[PDB]
Design a protein around this nucleic acid. Structure first.
Lengths: 122, 101, 175, 126, 365
RNA sequence: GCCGUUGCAUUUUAUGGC
């Protein structure tokens, strides 16, 4: 029935958009459910961001099944326009993937976002 | 020769010494430690008196380069430069003989 | 600075080089002096855990000490309860060094390649060229760390060894 | 090595009788030379031993049953403070041993990566 | 100087002359109008600058001269633009007008014969020009740059003065007055900074008010601040900003917090508020004009005590993405650059009346 | 200035599509 769970609140959404902004600054970001599915195959994916205003929505339902197979966190965001904007990118991106790097300059922000997401998934 | 752009601030009319004191700012990107001679030339063309009616000194530059701040002087006449200036600056500018003793 | 209490002790001696292996240092003097400053803070850190709650000493000399740790870029703001201050450790001051932040921000492909790039009149953070590896970035200066206007990899000159390589081509192949 | 504050420490039998007879506290002494928040522990082997020193050492028992100190359990009837700890230090690599008994202390310097203590809260690294 | 022109009541808004011009360009990014006869300058994402005469208020802007570059000018010392031009600004002497964009250069143009009189390399691969603003009655160019910089030039001598650092994302908007100071935003850092050029200091004002506390307001009786899109300077002692959620924030130089914030202005349409895509004030006055792609320029009157502002009204004559607002006077002539998309190359959704051109609106008294 | 449409009859004025 809901099909839009979990959907994030306000300050977590802008927090995620800022983390995606520095992630696009550090080329540690994947753009597209095609690419995101490939990163879920290679096991390099930290977590997955999906949009809620994508028409249709059922093209994006494969990512929770593949993530729950791989035990990977995921949270919906309401805008695909702002989700495109946080990529340093001027046309919308429906879904983005966070890649794995322990040498990442922004790693603590990624662990805090995974703390909020993994808090919300339970 | 990189568009020197000599900037002046702190201009106060001082008629009792017949002068106008002001802080010379020398921006110099891609140019290092220009002169004392060219400075007296290029600030006398906004006051339009003469080169030897212009005194200047000071100038400890910014660290790294690209900015220089000194202290500049302009008078109303040539004879005022011979009376109101120090005796060694006129030798430095060339306007006098240093009687060595 | 201050020397540690025991100079040769097995689990600590190998713990030196795993710090020297990741960060790429040259002297345990540059390790011990970092612990020395962490020593002096931590004694003061335990002083304000004894006194009364909402002491203005615990406020003025506490929170400014807390905010300065946020200001240097070490204490994350979520742990801003003066109880993570005891849970600080050695690598976090090592992590805020100017050498290691170059490698994290692409651009260095090593921690040892970035060490050479500090001492060769390259990368500046503000408009000041920094050539000391321990410059301790203040977290408001991260996305200003960049190649210089001069000193190529930044352009407008290719440099004395690239110009000499250009010089060799003109004299034998050309004239 | 990968050991972080808050530290956890094991108080055996020889420790408390060197604390009171030198008038240095248990918890507040541990915060001194470890320089962080400490989580003390006592096992079932150690506490029931001090019931056998009972009529001469009520002082040590009435300090050990304070809620600053936590309860820890093992399940063997017949084990000691001496031998039960060595199995605890074996299968995990994240405890700190507090003692002064040399007969136990030589069983601690052999397993690498194990922090020791001293006369009552004046610490020493491995 | 302070606010002294009090004429918000004198504006006859309901019968303002509304007109529109279609032009031969796709996605005009900016418009800059000179006042000493009045001129106009337009740049588009079709690589073109076009010069109009607007001295006749009853007429639509007629065409004088136009210049379009091309792919000839690929290198960066070429005297022509080879990508999208993001901003344009005319000099206060009417002699020059400078353009720049994604080609990361600055080309100074002559107003007379429309010739490339100067090309300046920014010398950074991230030194993209975003907003050019001149000091009133001066020639000191303030250049917002995508490598988080502010670069200051002189026009008459074509030199470089100095650079300001400090921001954390791309500096979109900068506004200035006749004194030597400017307001900047960084547009994702969710702050704005005041810049004193000879003092070489900054005063940092902070947005980012959480709507969660506003939910507290929802218990007493919304949308996220994510991007401070525009900034404008009303007087030397106050200014304003425009956001990504309809909030328009009034700011005082003595107030770290917002001295006012207006809630949703151009409205919504889970739900999406419109972006504050344009914001231009009449200098030293109490009147300012905000614009969206929603189709109606909303104009507001500042109170006399500088504490709140009130609705002057709406002008519905301009459908499409308003990118830049110019206001000239003698009467008042309002021009607005309507493009099919947002300035930044951004995506726009389902816009009614997709058209490109210039909005004109004359208000008497 | 690409197309369509209307009043002046197209220059002029207003509107829809790419």
């Amino acid at each position: 029935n809901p099909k839009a769970f979990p959907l994030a609140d306000a300050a977590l959404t802008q927090q995620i958009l800022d983390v995606v902004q520095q992630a696009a600054n550090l080329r540690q970001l994947k753009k597209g459910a095609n690419e995101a599915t490939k990163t879920l195959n290679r096991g390099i994916s930290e977590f997955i961001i999906m949009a809620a205003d994508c028409e249709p929505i059922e093209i994006l339902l494969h990512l929770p099944l593949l993530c729950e197979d791989k035990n990977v966190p995921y949270v919906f965001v309401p805008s695909r326009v702002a989700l495109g904007r946080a990529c340093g990118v001027s046309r919308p991106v429906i879904a983005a993937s966070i890649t794995t790097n322990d040498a990442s300059a922004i790693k603590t922000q990624i662990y805090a976002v995974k703390d909020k997401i993994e808090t919300l998934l339970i | 020769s990189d568009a020197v752009t000599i900037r002046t601030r702190k201009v106060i009319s001082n008629p009792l010494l017949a002068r106008k004191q002001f802080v010379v700012d020398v921006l110099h990107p891609n140019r290092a430690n220009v002169s004392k001679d060219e400075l007296r030339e290029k600030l006398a063309e906004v006051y339009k008196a003469e080169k030897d009616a212009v005194s200047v000194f000071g100038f400890r530059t910014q660290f790294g380069g690209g900015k220089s701040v000194g202290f500049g002087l302009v008078y109303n006449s040539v004879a005022e430069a011979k009376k109101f200036e120090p005796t060694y600056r006129l030798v430095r500018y060339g306007l006098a003989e240093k009687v060595e003793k | 600075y201050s020397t540690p209490k025991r100079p040769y002790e097995s689990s600590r001696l190998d713990a030196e080089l795993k710090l020297a292996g990741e960060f790429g240092l040259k002297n345990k003097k540059e390790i011990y002096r970092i612990s020395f400053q962490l020593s002096k803070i931590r004694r003061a850190a335990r002083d304000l855990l004894t006194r009364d709650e909402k002491d203005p000493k615990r406020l003025f000399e506490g929170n400014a000490l807390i905010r300065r740790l946020v200001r240097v870029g070490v204490l994350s703001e979520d742990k801003k309860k003066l109880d993570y201050v005891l849970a600080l450790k050695v690598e976090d001051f090592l992590e805020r060094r100017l050498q290691t932040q170059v490698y994290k921000l692409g651009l260095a492909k090593s921690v040892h390649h970035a060490r050479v790039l500090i001492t060769q009149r390259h990368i500046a953070v503000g408009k000041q060229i920094v050539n000391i590896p321990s410059f301790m970035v203040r977290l408001d200066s991260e996305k200003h760390i960049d190649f210089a206007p001069t000193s190529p990899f930044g352009g407008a000159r290719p440099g004395r060894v690239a110009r000499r390589n250009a010089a060799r081509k003109a004299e034998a192949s050309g004239e | 090595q990968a050991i972080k504050p808050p530290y956890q420490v094991l108080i055996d039998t020889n420790f408390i009788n060197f604390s009171i007879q030198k008038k240095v506290d248990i918890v507040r002494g541990m915060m001194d030379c470890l320089l962080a928040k400490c989580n003390p522990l006592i096992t079932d082997c150690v506490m029931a031993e001090l019931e056998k020193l009972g009529p001469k050492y009520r002082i040590a028992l009435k300090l050990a049953r304070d809620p600053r100190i936590k309860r820890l359990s093992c399940s063997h009837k017949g084990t000691y403070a001496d031998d039960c700890l060595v199995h605890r230090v074996l299968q995990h690599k994240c405890y700190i041993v507090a003692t002064n008994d040399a007969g136990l202390k030589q069983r601690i310097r052999k397993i690498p990566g194990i922090p020791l203590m001293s006369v009552g809260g004046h610490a020493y690294v491995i | 100087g302070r606010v002294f022109r009090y004429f918000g009541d004198k504006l006859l808004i309901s019968e303002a002359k509304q007109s529109f011009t279609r032009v031969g360009e796709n996605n005009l990014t900016c418009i800059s109008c000179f006042q000493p006869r009045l001129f106009a300058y337009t740049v588009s994402k079709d690589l073109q600058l076009t010069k109009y005469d607007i001295t006749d208020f009853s007429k639509r802007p007629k065409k004088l001269k136009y210049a379009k570059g091309g792919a000839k000018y690929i290198p960066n010392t070429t005297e022509g633009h080879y990508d999208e031009i993001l901003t344009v600004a005319a000099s206060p002497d009417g002699k020059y007008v400078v353009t720049g964009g994604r080609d990361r250069k600055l080309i100074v143009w002559s107003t007379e014969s429309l010739s490339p009189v100067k090309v300046i390399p920014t010398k950074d691969r991230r030194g993209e020009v975003l907003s050019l603003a001149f000091r009133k009655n001066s020639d000191q160019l303030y250049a917002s740059c995508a490598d988080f910089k502010i670069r200051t030039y002189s026009i008459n001598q074509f030199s470089q003065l100095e650079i300001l650092y400090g921001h954390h994302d791309i500096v979109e908007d900068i506004s200035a007055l006749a004194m030597e100071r400017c307001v900047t935003v960084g547009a994702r850092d969710r702050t704005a900074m005041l810049w004193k050029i000879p003092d070489e200091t900054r005063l940092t004002f902070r947005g980012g008010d959480e709507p969660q506390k506003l939910l507290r307001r929802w218990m007493k009786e919304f949308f996220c601040e994510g991007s401070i899109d525009v900034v404008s300077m009303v007087d030397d002692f106050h200014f304003i900003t425009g956001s990504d959620n309809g909030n328009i924030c009034l700011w005082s130089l003595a107030k770290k917090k917002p001295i006012f914030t207006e809630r949703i202005a151009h409205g919504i349409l889970l739900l999406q508020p419109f972006w504050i895509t344009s914001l231009y004030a009449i200098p030293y006055s109490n009147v300012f004009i905000s614009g969206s792609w929603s189709g109606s320029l909303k104009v507001w009157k500042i109170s006399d005590n500088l504490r709140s502002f009130e609705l002057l009204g709406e002008l519905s004559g301009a459908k499409g993405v308003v990118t830049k607002i110019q206001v000239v006077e003698s009467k008042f002539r309002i021009l607005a650059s309507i493009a099919k998309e947002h300035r930044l190359g951004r995506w726009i959704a389902n816009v009614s009346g997709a058209r490109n051109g210039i909005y004109s609106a004359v208000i008497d008294q």
